[PDB]
Amino acid sequence: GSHMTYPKYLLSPETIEALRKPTFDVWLWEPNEMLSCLEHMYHDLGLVRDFSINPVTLRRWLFCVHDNYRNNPFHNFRHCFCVAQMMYSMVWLCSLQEKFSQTDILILMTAAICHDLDHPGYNNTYQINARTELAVRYNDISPLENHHCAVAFQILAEPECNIFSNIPPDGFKQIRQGMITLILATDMARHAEIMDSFKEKMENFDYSNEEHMTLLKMILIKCCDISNEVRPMEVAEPWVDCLLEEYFMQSDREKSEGLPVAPFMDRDKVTKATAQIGFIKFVLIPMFETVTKLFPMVEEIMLQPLWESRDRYEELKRIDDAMKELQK
Amino acid sequence: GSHMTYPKYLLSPETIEALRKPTFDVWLWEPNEMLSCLEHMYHDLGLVRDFSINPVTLRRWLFCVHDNYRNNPFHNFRHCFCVAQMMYSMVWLCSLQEKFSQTDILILMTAAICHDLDHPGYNNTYQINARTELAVRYNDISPLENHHCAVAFQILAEPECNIFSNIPPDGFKQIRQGMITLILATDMARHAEIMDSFKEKMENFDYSNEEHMTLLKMILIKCCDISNEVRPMEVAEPWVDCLLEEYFMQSDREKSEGLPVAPFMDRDKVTKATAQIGFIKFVLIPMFETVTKLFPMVEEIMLQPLWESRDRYEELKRIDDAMKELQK
Ligand SMILES: Nc1nc2c(ncn2[C@@H]2O[C@@H]3COP(=O)(O)O[C@H]3[C@H]2O)c(=O)[nH]1
Ligand SMILES: CC(C)Cn1c(=O)n(C)c(=O)c2nc[nH]c21
Ligand code: NA
Ligand code: NA
Ligand code: NA
Numbered sequence: 017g018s019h020m021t022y023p024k025y026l027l028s029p030e031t032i033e034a035l036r037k038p039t040f041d042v043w044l045w046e047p048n049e050m051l052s053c054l055e056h057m058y059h060d061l062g063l064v065r066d067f068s069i070n071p072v073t074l075r076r077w078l079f080c081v082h083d084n085y086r087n088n089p090f091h092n093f094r095h096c097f098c099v100a101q102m103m104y105s106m107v108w109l110c111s112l113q114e115k116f117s118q119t120d121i122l123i124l125m126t127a128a129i130c131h132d133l134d135h136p137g138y139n140n141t142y143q144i145n146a147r148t149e150l151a152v153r154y155n156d157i158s159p160l161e162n163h164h165c166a167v168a169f170q171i172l173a174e175p176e177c178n179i180f181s182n183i184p185p186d187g188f189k190q191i192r193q194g195m196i197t198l199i200l201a202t203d204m205a206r207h208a209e210i211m212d213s214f215k216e217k218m219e220n221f222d223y224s225n226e227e228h229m230t231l232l233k234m235i236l237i238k239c240c241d242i243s244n245e246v247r248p249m250e251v252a253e254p255w256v257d258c259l260l261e262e263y264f265m266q267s268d269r270e271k272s273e274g275l276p277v278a279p280f281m282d283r284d285k286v287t288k289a290t291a292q293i294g295f296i297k298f299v300l301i302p303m304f305e306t307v308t309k310l311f312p313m314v315e316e317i318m319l320q321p322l323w324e325s326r327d328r329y330e331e332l333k334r335i336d337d338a339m340k341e342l343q344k
Numbered sequence: 345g346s347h348m349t350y351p352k353y354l355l356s357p358e359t360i361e362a363l364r365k366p367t368f369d370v371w372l373w374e375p376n377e378m379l380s381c382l383e384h385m386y387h388d389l390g391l392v393r394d395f396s397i398n399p400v401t402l403r404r405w406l407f408c409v410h411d412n413y414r415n416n417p418f419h420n421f422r423h424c425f426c427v428a429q430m431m432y433s434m435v436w437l438c439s440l441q442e443k444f445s446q447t448d449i450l451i452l453m454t455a456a457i458c459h460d461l462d463h464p465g466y467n468n469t470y471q472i473n474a475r476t477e478l479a480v481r482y483n484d485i486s487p488l489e490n491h492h493c494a495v496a497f498q499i500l501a502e503p504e505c506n507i508f509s510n511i512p513p514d515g516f517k518q519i520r521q522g523m524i525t526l527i528l529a530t531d532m533a534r535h536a537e538i539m540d541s542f543k544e545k546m547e548n549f550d551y552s553n554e555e556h557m558t559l560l561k562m563i564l565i566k567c568c569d570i571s572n573e574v575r576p577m578e579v580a581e582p583w584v585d586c587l588l589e590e591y592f593m594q595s596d597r598e599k600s601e602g603l604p605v606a607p608f609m610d611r612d613k614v615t616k617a618t619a620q621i622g623f624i625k626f627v628l629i630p631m632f633e634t635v636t637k638l639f640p641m642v643e644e645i646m647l648q649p650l651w652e653s654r655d656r657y658e659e660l661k662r663i664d665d666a667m668k669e670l671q672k
């Protein structure tokens with residue numbers, strides 16, 4: 017492209033373009049570049065325009081969100097960026113601006129950015145079984161997700177970060193409610209429940225029914241959260257090692273502290289391949305299959321990579337197993 | 345009775361007998377006497393026996409619970425004592441020991457004691473509208489009740505207060521879950537919902553069905569919580585002035601802060617009579633009417649007092665109105 021060279025935090029035209037697509041390489045970029053991307057999304061989606069978001073607050077706020085993500089192997093700022101960027105992608109892929117109000121898009125995007133704030137890197141089962149302060153604070157009800165959500169609104173309450181400061185109270189209340197529903201909906205304990213409620217509505221789906229649309233937004237955020245395997249293989253694959261890093265940290269600690277261990281986080285019973293095959297076949301494909309009933313373009317862009325990944329992990333397993341047929 | 349005088353915190357035989365009935369005068373007693381009452385309940389119901397509760401811990405725990413109630417006009421330690429004492433009365437009145445396990449009795453009683461821990465004296469609507477720390481911590485979801493419950497388990501986690509220290513983890517988990525459900529059930533925003541679910545189960549109630557029993561337990565705690573008017577008039581009436589004292593404190597503060605004022609708390613609009621008539625006819629009677637379907641002894645002991653009070657309060661209003669009219 018360009019006749020001179022610019023700082024990396026000035027995103028190039030090529031990057032801006034690439035950012036609209038689920039093929040975007042989320043590993044290329046350092047945090048301040050990711051922060052620029054998130055900023056751009058808010059401008060590009062018309063959210064700054066339509067909600068009078070002070071552009072410097074938008075930046076202060078993102079910087080502050082960034083500060084409140086922790087350096088976990090998986091549940092970190094980059095993960096949050098994936099989730100937000102996949103939501104961005106979904107807005108274009110599925111022409112969500114035809115279907116949803118700008119308020120709904122604000123909710124989706126802001127929920128996506130905030131959905132894992134201050135995650136400690138051990139899940140709700142650890143919290144509850146260890147009787148941690150969070151588990152006690154929230155009475156064993158989606159403690160992490162309640163916490164993410166609370167931290168979100170603590171941040172937004174600081175005046176210099178309050179991107180909603182020019183939205184009237186009714187709008188604030190509408191956004192707040194939406195975000196709480198959506199962030200809480202990311203608790204995988206509720207996956208089967210949420211999927212069932214959705215499928216029920218899908219029997220006769222209605223874009224002007226608020227309840228249908230809440231459930232769609234819940235499915236949308238859930239899709240984005242667990243979307244890593246939708247991405248190109250070279251981009252998706254590193255995330256699995258991060259996931260297991262975090263799972264193994266937790267399951268080791270559980271063993272050490274006499275707490276119950278989950279077999280799907282058990283160092284002894286788990287490889288990349290076995291982790292991903294079940295998850296792809298039984299969580300991701302089905303979810304995206306139903307989304308596709310509403311948005312057919314999803315099949316080609318997102319079900320296909322999932323099929324390809326499923327098949328590759330199946331191959332890899334064949335060879336992992338062989339490899340342990342030496343040994344043991 | 346007795347051949348010598350004993351300290352007030354040694355309950356007399358006559359007190360021990362009277363404690364078992366809903367006629368007990370909750371106003372006669374000082375905190376330490378009320379604590380000795382709660383203590384006796386745990387021994388008398390076999391809970392000290394069946395859960396190996398260390399008797400000194402039972403006392404530390406009750407003292408600590410007492411310290412974490414605030415000195416509000418209504419939501420104070422004495423109210424907590426009423427709710428617990430009414431649950432104790434209900435256990436005998438309804439022969440609940442025939443229907444419920446001791447684990448369930450433990451849940452009902454401990455929930456009853458803890459259900460309003462650290463109440464600030466302003467309701468959930470105030471917390472949500474004023475956007476308080478509790479509202480933000482709990483994302484607008486039954487913040488008070490979540491808080492009471494968190495404080496309950498904060499107390500029980502202090503080893504010197506852990507009356508559950510000799511229960512195995514499976515028991516603990518079972519008790520904790522129950523207590524959370526029951527304390528959360530006390531939020532009156534959920535009244536109509538909970539009542540409807542119960543009425544559904546009542547169409548063919550089944551004491552062996554865990555969901556039926558959760559709902560029953562929920563109803564029982566809700567009964568005891570709002571049970572003031574079930575008591576003898578001279579014991580019931582002073583509580584109305586306390587309730588209004590708290591309500592008026594809230595609406596005054598809302599008026600001052602520019603927040604919305606609920607008419608039922610507006611000192612310009614409310615009287616003892618108007619407060620209680622609607623509440624009796626339309627929340628209390630119906631609730632106890634359905635409990636009577638399972639426990640017909642409840643009619644004579646609790647509906648009758650509620651009818652008497654209703655009629656008394658309608659009559660007070662008829663008089664109030666005759667004054668109002670007589671001036672203007
Ligand atoms: N096996 C597997 N699990 C995943 C993947 N992505 C997300 N998850 C799981 O789904 C969960 C969604 O919510 P969390 O962020 O709590 O934690 C996530 C992981 O436990 C993946 O690629 N593979
Ligand atoms: C509107 C009503 C729920 C308010 N309310 C209440 O919650 N409790 C517990 C009472 O005793 C009561 N008495 C009058 N109004 C009351
Ligand atoms: Na999450
Ligand atoms: Na997540
Ligand atoms: Na309460």
Ligand code: NA
Pocket residue numbers: 459460530569
């Ligand atoms: Na109460």
